[PDB]
Design a protein around this ligand. Structure first.
Ligand code: HEA
Ligand code: HEA
Ligand SMILES: [Cu+2]
Ligand SMILES: [Mg+2]
Lengths: 243, 674, 97, 35, 211, 346, 318
């Protein structure tokens, strides 16, 4: 199959070889931030940045897109039951299709609700961030992600915001808007998924806001001045106001 | 110095001859006279494969016969159809499932699972392994071989005259009496040492006073002067006539037939009803099978009582489920085998000595024979289906890396089911008309038997949950076995109703129940255990693609052939019928198509075995030596080793970024460039 | 000399002479240019630069602009994972039917 | 054991226990150990 | 023990007629011993995780998606038995050896694979055996697998096949009335000359001739 | 009489049987000219549709590489109009129409004619489904093997016609059209270039044809109960059968192209011999031995499924419309179907 | 089956000769590259043999053809051997056909349903083929000398430009026409083995298919394939020996191994390659034989069917 020639194929092969030769796993880093406050990491060597309960701040039962289909299913049920149009048996069976698919939008919205970052912590060293969420079935799932994997999105979320010089928070530290951020690869439950967009809600509290912005900017932080908080105030699967 | 030998070719030929002699010696040592359990099991497995192929061919023939109403295949040979049905039943039950399971699984596992050195009587084990072929062949030749050897078009009249010794009886008188012997020499020759064939054709020849109807094939006796062959050559296919009429009787020997898997007296127990032939052959084969089963049971049970390891003396809960089922079924077989043998001996005595052991005239009763057969009947099926449950239980625990649901409860349930199977004799003979008390007791015992099966199903389902699932080819087969066992239990429970049984006794519903319980569950479990232990038995890793194809086609074929049968049973199609009304054509054709799909799946499994042999790649235990992560350190070590082995295995594969770039830039066919 | 398997001899050489190009001189010249300009001369398909009603593409957009959520994903070790959370979510619906 | 003497005759009273063409009994067919 | 001498034809690098099994490039079963004791895998890094210590190196970022290419490590091909040596290892010197087990673990009979062509028959065994029971044995009858051809006109007799008489039955008004009733389907053939020509609508090939 | 081998002609007697409509009797309509015409028509239509779809998809991909994805329904309409306006798309339509005429004339039509010549005789059941489902299994496999390599020449011609424009015009051989390239290149480079290591194409075509034919026949015969027991429309049933067959064919076929790409696109490791050694048959062997099956299935939908599966579906639908899947069925107990009328009414 | 034959109409000698010439020319042209490759393969492993194991064994005809095409001459280099081998094939076919036609005319059974028995027909065919192949040993050597120069060193090459030039060079350098018969016995044996390894199995398989599957259409092709496989298996060592013998160049130093005859060649092959050395390129040889047989059988059978239909034999008699 290699007998035929294409200069596009040759260029692609050369580019692939160049990428395999030059682009390496070990890469130098330049975006480095030195914080303005000595950070007191918790007993597990972590500093909390954003705490939120989006479930407590979400309209779950009565949603906008799902309600329309969820209510319209009865109309199709009645049409099939009463045969108002006087169609054939096959046509009635076809008309029965609508009720069997209505669950898809509600399921999609509920799944989307799980991607919101409920809790965010930064471990010692300023390279891995722990994001914890809760699936609406009450499934507490946490995952550690690399610092470089974050990329901000615009307030309109229609275009990728600049990785630097973004102003997504108020001066005091509160978030200026419900922010969306893209992660290239997130290891959820051990399985890596590509190009996943997470959201931080405005209702969340930005504890130690500056580092959070550094987490938003994606630059690595210099964890020089670190204190240790000796308080095991967190219990194993401790109950949370988000439920 | 240099040696100039004239024949380096002869040197190489001598080397080849020495290789041949050494190969013959080594083959006799490690494949003929070997006492190794592994070698004996491998031989038994190959023989079982051959026997199962023969049985599947018989089943395919039956399905083709039943495919279309009007007897298109058997051409109305009802006796041949009955013989073929009996042969299929006996070969699959008494020569396929029992041989394969017992020989292969026991010989392979008892040395390993029971942890005993070889067998209790290795000589007996080898004897049985070498002896099974005789019964295998004998039970498989009945459908093609019959005492009525001549063909329907074979004009046996031309040759049978030569067989008549009464033609020359006269000279027999004077052989030892010579006083008037010469007087016999003074007679006139009419038929003395002569054969005159009457005109077989209407010849209107006025010039011919006599017409020679003698066989043209025997015109020159000189040709017959040295031919050491019978006169049937002249009687074998020397006419062009053909009777393509379903009304034309093709047997004329209606007494020569078979009485199915269970010998039904007095039809089987009377020469007038069952002629000499297939019935006697089957009785002798049953006797031989009983002897072989006794030998196997002694060889197996003797080791378990004596050759147990230091720690496995009494606590049977430690042994694997398959081995426990093996021991329990061995005990159960040791129970009913003497009764089956005595019943066979009595049937043979009735057939050949006329003891009236089944004649209602002077004391006998067919109910006695039916009761004996049923006392051998239900325990046989119960023992047969038992090992597959242990196989499935052993397969599931390793795949999920979790403890079984209730091992002691499952073992006790299996033992209770075995104990209960000895009291369901009247269940299969509900329509024989026993005393109403006996019928009620039998029905109540049959209904209560489902209590252990529900425990087993619940235990399997519960053990399948809350575990670390590692999907292998074995897991899918175990799931298929469970799914097949689900329907069979419901069908059996429904058939336990007295009214439903009276409405469906001895019908296609019963046929479907029996097939789905045996052909589906047991064969599926056997295949699962084969895949679960493919490496140790074969030495090479299985072929993933062909194994998946086999697991797909085999699982589907069973349902495809059993659903139409159950549907016809709901329509009340009688069992063991050579033809059916046209109303059953659709379901019969669906069942035939399912049987063909099952045959295709078997071919796929054979191709899978061939591909696995051609692969020659070492297999690695997915458990990696830690089948249970009972500790956090064990779980961590398993995770680390799995990550390392994945990184090593995923070496040389293009990286994620490069693969994505290539996949994106795949399309390179553009019209005009810059 | 020959028949001495200990050291291979040129008498055992089975080499066919390379007379001319297999496909032609045009193919030979094209191969020479490709080996000379692999990754250097990159022709691009012709596309109208100015398109009213179509905003020029300037960078990669966030995944929020995709019109269909794919199922199979790429594990960074080079794997092509089918079993994903999105796969489970998509498999939940049909199984209900 | 054709053309390859695997067995030794001195330890075997009856040579020929296996099909072979490179052996012969030390005790000849006309031999008789006498007293 | 021991081995033969050097032969250039036995070296795949020299002999160009040796085709290399791409699934057995890095594995040479001829080097396998019983019991096997060759280490072939250890902790390997620097493929996706750098072997250097960059745990707290803020100036270093690990990019697992940019892994460099490596050599594919084929699985361990199944061992091939060196029959000759095995023929010596499993050989027996009768009536001169006590029935005792040699102390060496190397005396254990390791079952190594050999030729594969035998298993090839096992691939076609389900087919061949089937033919053996259906084609070679011609069960259940000779004509069951023969090519289908109807009997000729008035063959073998008018008793079994009065086809011409059927034509007469198809020529009368009553039979015609039967056609009008729709209960009796149209004629299955037509008598042309002394032969029976089955129309294409019959769906059956022409009857065989009387050779 | 002419060569070493001899096929002696031997006469034999006639045979008689009870039934006569259960074997393999060639249909009178199963003729060379009619089969060729029907296959040519169906293949041309399906190939034309597939080529137009492929051209449109490639133009849309180029536009997406040129402009951002549409943001609304109106944006999608505008982007579609802009893509359709491409003169590159028009030239691609012309070239793909030529290539499609060539391929559906010589590959899909050829496979269909071979299947018709191979499955003409297998009659079905009067009141059920074809129980002899393995009777045509060898016929389908042999027929697929016959036409498996028939398309490789045209595929290579198209690849070369679209492959030379990438190189500089100083080495351009012309190729005014796909037909012009097919006419000129065979007289220029020799036939061996069009058949050099075409194993991937041969395997893909064989697998696709076998899957399509066998699945369509088995589904049509078996699933008739869905149109018989249940009173379905059977038209949606035919469409569903076609869709399932297309999906199965794509799943069973993409691995060959995947192996070919892996051999021809995976970055070569410096300082080592090629893992596949440059034959790619081992690649299939590797594909037949890989532990991670998904590793040999990446980009299946993206790469070729959206380009040829619609063609296969259209071909199946057109074959159904042309009636090339016709299997005879006569009453096994009435009239011509039997020779012993006695065992039919008593 | 003795009276089962069907020979109601018989062809004429001239028509048979012409049909044989045309069909054999077509079949040889189709199989010219296959024969050339099979000859080339046997020269490559004349002293190495098959050193691969299990399924890797044998010489890849695809790889050999790829190398031959890549040699530089392309597909145009596949007719160099066909230039002279065609004339020799035609001559051998003509001689064998004339001898067999005369023999069959002198010994045919009277009844058209009765033919000469298998043994007698095989004997007549073997005699005709042996005579014909003994006639064309020079042509076989000349054709072989052309293809053999490719896998052989240029210094060891024979240098034949075709048929007449090669014949002149051989008659001059090698001493004379006596060298033309080097391996004539081998060629005669190859033809004789070919003359008896086909008809028997072909008729057996045809009758078996007729009994088992009726008078189906696949019977002829299946019997042809089975007969081709059996004849290739039977004649494979003979063809290899004949090639290795006729390929023996005059210069002993230019020969990898010296063959003083069939016995010497066989002894050397057994010493070096063993028993398996006779099965070199069996797939390629079987493919060539099957292709030639299929082409010739199809063309000749179509022509004969047209001629018999013109003659007017009954549908059962045709
Ligand atoms: C290995 C084979 C096998 C097995 C395991 C069984 C198991 C059972 N069988 Fe039988 N049987 C045969 C093989 C088998 N059988 C054969 C070959 C015949 C015919 C002999 C002949 O030809 O006459 C026969 C005949 C036969 C008959 C009479 C048919 C006739 O008249 O001859 C009856 C009726 O009482 C019966 C009942 C049962 C019952 C009640 C079980 C129970 O063990 C199974 C019931 C258990 C369950 C019910 C548990 C399942 C769990 C569930 C929770 C199911 C519920 C699920 C859903 C509803 C979704 N069997
Ligand atoms: C375990 C026993 C067993 C098995 C497996 C089968 C399998 C099949 N049986 Fe039956 N059958 C019986 C036991 C069995 N049968 C009995 C006892 C009777 C009644 C006898 C009587 O009437 O008295 C009967 C009767 C019977 C009839 C009589 C019809 C009637 O009564 O009206 C028919 C007709 O269709 C039939 C069909 C089939 C078919 C189509 C299969 C298909 O499943 C065949 C498929 C092949 C197999 C399932 C074997 C697997 C093949 C192997 C080679 C395994 C070896 C490989 C591995 C290592 C796994 N069977
Ligand atoms: Cu029972
Ligand atoms: Mg009953």
């Amino acid at each position: 199959l290699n007998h035929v020639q294409n200069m596009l194929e040759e260029n692609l092969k050369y580019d692939a070889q160049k990428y395999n030769d030059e682009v390496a796993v070990i890469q130098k880093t330049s975006r480095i931030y030195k914080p303005t406050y000595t950070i007191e990491f918790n007993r597990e060597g972590e500093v909390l940045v954003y705490s939120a309960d989006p479930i407590k701040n979400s309209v779950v039962y009565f949603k906008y897109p799902y309600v329309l289909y969820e209510a319209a299913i009865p109309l199709f049920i009645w049409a099939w039951i009463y045969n108002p149009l006087e169609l054939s048996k096959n046509a009635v069976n076809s008309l029965l299709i609508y009720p069997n698919i209505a669950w898809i939008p509600r399921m999609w919205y509920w799944r989307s609700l799980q991607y919101k970052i409920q809790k965010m912590y930064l471990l010692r060293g300023g390279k891995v961030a722990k994001i914890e969420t809760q699936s609406l079935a009450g499934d507490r799932f946490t995952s550690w992600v690399e610092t470089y994997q974050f990329h901000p999105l615009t307030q309109d979320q229609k275009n990728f915001d600049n990785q630097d010089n973004a102003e997504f928070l108020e001066d005091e530290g509160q978030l200026k808007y419900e922010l969306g951020v893209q992660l290239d690869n997130l290891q959820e439950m051990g399985t890596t998924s590509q190009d996943i967009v997470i959201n931080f809600m405005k209702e969340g509290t930005v504890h130690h806001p500056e580092l959070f912005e550094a987490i938003v900017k994606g630059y690595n932080i210099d964890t020089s001045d670190y204190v240790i908080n000796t308080a095991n105030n967190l219990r194993a699967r401790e109950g949370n106001h988000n439920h | 110095v240099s040696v100039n030998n004239y024949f380096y070719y002869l040197d190489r030929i001598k080397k080849l001859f020495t290789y041949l002699n050494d190969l013959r010696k080594h083959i006799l040592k490690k494949y003929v006279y070997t006492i190794n359990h592994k070698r004996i099991a491998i031989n038994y497995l190959y023989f079982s494969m051959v026997t199962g192929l023969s049985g599947a061919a018989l089943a395919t023939m039956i399905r083709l016969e039943l495919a279309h109403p009007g007897s298109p295949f058997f051409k109305g040979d009802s006796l041949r159809y009955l013989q073929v049905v009996t042969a299929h039943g006996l070969i699959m039950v008494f020569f396929v499932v029992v041989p394969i399971l017992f020989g292969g699984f026991a010989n392979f596992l008892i040395p390993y699972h029971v942890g005993s050195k070889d067998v209790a009587y290795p000589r007996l084990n080898s004897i049985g392994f070498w002896i099974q072929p005789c019964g295998y062949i004998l039970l498989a030749k009945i459908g093609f071989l019959r005492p009525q050897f001549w063909r329907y078009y074979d004009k046996t009249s031309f040759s049978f005259p030569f067989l008549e010794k009464m033609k020359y009886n006269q000279y027999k008188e004077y052989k030892n009496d010579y006083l008037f012997y010469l007087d016999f020499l003074k007679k006139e020759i009419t038929d003395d040492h002569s054969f005159f064939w009457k005109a077989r054709k209407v010849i209107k020849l006025p010039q011919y006073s006599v017409f020679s109807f003698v066989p043209l094939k025997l015109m020159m006796w000189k040709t017959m002067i040295n031919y050491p062959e019978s006169f049937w050559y002249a009687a074998s296919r020397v006419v062009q006539s053909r009777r393509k009429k379903v009304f034309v009787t093709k047997c004329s020997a209606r007494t020569l037939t078979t009485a199915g898997w269970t010998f039904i007296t007095p039809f089987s127990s009377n020469i007038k009803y069952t002629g000499v032939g297939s019935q006697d052959i089957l009785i002798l084969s049953v006797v031989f099978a009983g002897i072989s089963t006794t030998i196997s049971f002694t060889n197996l049970l003797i080791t378990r009582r004596t050759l147990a390891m230091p720690g496995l003396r009494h606590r049977r809960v430690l042994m694997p489920f398959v081995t426990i089922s093996i021991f329990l079924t061995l005990r159960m077989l040791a129970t009913i085998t003497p009764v089956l043998g005595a019943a066979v001996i009595m049937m043979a005595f009735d057939r050949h000595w006329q003891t009236t052991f089944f004649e209602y005239a002077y004391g006998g009763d067919p109910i006695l024979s039916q009761h004996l057969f049923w006392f051998f009947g239900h325990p046989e099926v119960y023992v047969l289906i038992i090992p597959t449950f242990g196989f499935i239980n052993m397969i599931v625990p390793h795949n999920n890396t979790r403890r079984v649901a209730s091992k002691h409860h499952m073992i006790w349930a299996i033992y209770v089911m075995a104990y209960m199977g000895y009291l369901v004799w009247g269940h299969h003979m509900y329509l024989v008309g026993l005393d109403h008390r006996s019928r009620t007791m039998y029905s109540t015992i049959t209904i209560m038997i489902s209590m252990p099966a529900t425990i087993k199903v619940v235990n399997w389902t519960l053990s399948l949950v809350n575990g670390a699932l590692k999907i292998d080819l074995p897991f899918l087969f175990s799931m298929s076995f469970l799914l097949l066992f689900l329907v069979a239990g419901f069908t059996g429970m429904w058939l336990s109703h007295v009214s439903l049984n009276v409405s469906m006794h001895d019908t296609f519903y019963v046929v479907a129940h029996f097939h789905i319980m045996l052909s589906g569950a047991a064969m599926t479990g056997i295949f699962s255990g084969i895949y679960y232990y493919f490496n140790a038995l074969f030495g090479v890793k299985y072929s993933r693609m062909f194994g998946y194809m086999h697991l797909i086609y085999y699982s589907g074929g069973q349902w495809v052939a059993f659903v139409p049968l159950f549907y016809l049973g709901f329509s009340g199609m009688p069992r063991r019928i050579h033809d059916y009304p046209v109303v059953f054509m659709g379901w019969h054709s669906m069942s035939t198509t399912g049987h063909f799909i099952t045959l295709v799946g078997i071919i796929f499994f054979f191709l899978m075995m061939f591909d696995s042999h051609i692969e020659r790649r070492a297999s690695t235990s997915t458990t990696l030596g830690l089948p249970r992560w009972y500790k956090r350190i064990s779980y961590y070590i398993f995770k680390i080793r799995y990550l390392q082995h994945t990184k090593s295995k995923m070496n040389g594969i293009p990286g994620s970024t490069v693969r994505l770039m290539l996949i994106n830039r795949h399309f390179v066919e553009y019209e005009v460039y810059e | 000399d020959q028949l001495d398997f200990s050291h291979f001899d040129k008498a055992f050489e089975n080499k066919y002479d390379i007379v001319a190009p297999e496909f032609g001189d045009l193919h030979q010249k094209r191969a020479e240019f490709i080996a000379k300009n692999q990754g250097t001369y990159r022709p691009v398909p012709l596309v109208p630069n100015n398109i009213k009603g179509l905003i020029p593409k300037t960078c990669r957009l966030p995944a929020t602009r995709n019109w269909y959520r794919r199922t199979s994903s790429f594990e960074r070790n080079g794997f092509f994972n089918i079993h994903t959370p999105v796969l489970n979510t998509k498999m939940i619906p049909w199984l209900l039917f | 054991c054709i053309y390859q003497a695997y067995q030794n005759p001195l330890r075997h009273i009856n040579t020929g226990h296996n099909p072979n063409n490179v052996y012969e009994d030390i005790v000849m067919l006309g031999d008789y150990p006498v007293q | 023990h021991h081995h033969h001498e050097y032969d250039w034809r036995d070296d795949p690098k020299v002999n160009k007629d040796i085709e290399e099994d791409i699934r057995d490039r890095g594995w040479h079963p001829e080097t396998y011993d019983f019991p096997y004791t060759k280490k072939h895998d250890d902790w390997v890094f620097d493929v996706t995780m750098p072997s250097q210590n960059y745990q707290t190196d803020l100036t270093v970022n690990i990019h697992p998606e940019n892994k460099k290419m490596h050599v594919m490590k084929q699985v361990m091909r199944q061992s091939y038995w060196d029959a000759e040596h095995d023929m010596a290892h499993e050989y027996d010197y009768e009536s001169e050896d006590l029935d005792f087990q040699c102390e060496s673990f190397k005396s254990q009979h390791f079952r190594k694979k050999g030729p594969i062509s035998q298993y090839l028959i096992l691939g076609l065994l389900p087919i061949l055996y089937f033919g053996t029971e259906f084609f070679y044995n011609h069960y259940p009858d000779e004509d069951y697998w023969r090519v289908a051809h109807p009997p000729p006109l008035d063959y073998p007799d008018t008793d079994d096949t009065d086809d011409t008489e059927t034509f007469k039955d198809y020529k009368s008004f009553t039979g015609r009335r039967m056609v009008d009733t729709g209960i009796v389907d149209p004629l299955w053939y037509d008598i042309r000359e002394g032969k029976k020509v089955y129309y294409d609508w019959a769906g059956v090939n022409q009857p065989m001739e009387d050779i | 009489m002419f060569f070493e081998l001899e096929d002696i002609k031997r006469r034999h007697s006639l045979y008689w049987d009870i039934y006569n409509v259960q074997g393999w009797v060639r249909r009178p309509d199963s003729t060379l000219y009619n089969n060729v015409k029907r296959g040519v028509t169906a293949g041309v239509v399906a190939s034309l549709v597939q080529e137009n779809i492929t051209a449109l998809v490639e133009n849309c991909k180029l536009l997406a590489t040129k402009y951002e994805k549409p943001q609304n329904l109106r944006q999608a309409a505008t982007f579609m109009k802009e893509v359709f306006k491409l003169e590159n798309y028009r030239k691609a339509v012309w070239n793909r129409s030529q290539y499609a005429l060539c391929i559906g004339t010589f590959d899909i039509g050829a496979r269909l004619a071979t299947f018709r010549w191979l499955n003409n005789g297998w009659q079905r059941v009067f009141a059920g489904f074809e129980f002899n489902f393995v009777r045509k299994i060898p016929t389908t496999m042999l027929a697929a093997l016959f036409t498996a390599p028939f398309s490789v020449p045209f595929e290579l011609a198209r690849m070369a016609y679209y492959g030379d424009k990438t190189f500089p015009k100083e080495l351009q051989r012309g190729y005014s059209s796909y037909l012009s390239a097919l006419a000129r290149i065979p007289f220029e480079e020799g036939p061996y270039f069009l058949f050099k290591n075409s194993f991937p194409l041969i395997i893909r075509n064989f697998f696709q044809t076998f899957t399509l034919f066998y699945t369509y026949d088995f589904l049509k015969d078996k699933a008739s109960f869905a149109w018989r027991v249940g009173e379905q429309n059977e038209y949606a049933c035919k469409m569903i059968i076609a869709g399932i067959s297309t999906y199965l064919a794509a799943v069973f076929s993409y691995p060959w192209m995947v192996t070919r790409e892996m051999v021809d696109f995976w970055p070569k490791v410096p300082g080592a011999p090629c893992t596949f050694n440059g034959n790619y048959r081992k690649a299939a062997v590797w594909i037949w031995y890989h532990e991670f099956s998904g590793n040999y299935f990446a980009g299946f939908f993206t790469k070729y499924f959206w380009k040829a599966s619609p063609g296969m579906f259209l071909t199946l639908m057109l074959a159904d419309k042309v009636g090339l899947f016709d299997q005879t069925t006569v009453d096994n107990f009435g009239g011509a179907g039997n020779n012993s009328w006695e065992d039919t009414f008593v | 089956m003795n009276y089962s034959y069907k020979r109601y109409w018989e062809p004429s000698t001239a028509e048979v000769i012409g049909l044989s010439l045309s069909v054999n020319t077509i079949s040889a042209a189709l199989t010219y590259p296959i024969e050339f490759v099979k000859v080339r393969s046997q020269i490559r492993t004349e002293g190495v043999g098959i050193r691969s194991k299990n399924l890797y064994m044998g010489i890849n005809p695809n790889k050999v053809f790829r190398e031959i095409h890549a040699t530089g001459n392309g597909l145009r280099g596949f007719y160099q051997g066909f230039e002279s081998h065609l004339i020799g094939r035609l001559s051998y076919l003509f001689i064998r056909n004339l001898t067999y036609k005369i023999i069959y005319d002198r010994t045919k059974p009277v009844k058209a349903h009765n033919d000469l028995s298998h043994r007698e027909k095989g004997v007549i065919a073997g005699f005709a083929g042996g005579l014909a192949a003994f006639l064309t040993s020079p042509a076989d050597l000349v054709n072989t000398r052309t293809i053999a120069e490719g896998g052989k060193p240029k210094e060891w090459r024979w240098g034949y430009k075709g048929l007449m030039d090669g014949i002149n060079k051989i008659a001059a350098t090698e001493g004379g026409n006596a060298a033309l018969f080097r391996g004539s016995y081998a060629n005669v044996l190859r033809a004789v083995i070919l003359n008896i390894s086909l008809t028997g199995p072909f008729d057996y398989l045809n009758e078996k298919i007729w009994i088992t599957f009726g008078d189906m259409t696949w019977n002829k092709y299946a019997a042809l394939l089975w007969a081709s496989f059996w004849g290739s298996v039977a004649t494979l060592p003979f063809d290899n020996i004949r090639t290795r013998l006729y390929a023996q160049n005059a210069d002993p130093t230019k020969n990898r191994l010296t063959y003083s005859g069939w016995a010497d060649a066989a002894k050397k092959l057994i010493q070096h390659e063993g028993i398996s050395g006779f099965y070199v390129g069996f797939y390629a040889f079987y493919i060539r034989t099957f292709l030639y047989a299929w082409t010739t059988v199809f063309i000749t059978d179509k022509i004969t069917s047209d001629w018999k239909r013109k003659a007017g034999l009954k549908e059962w008699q045709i």
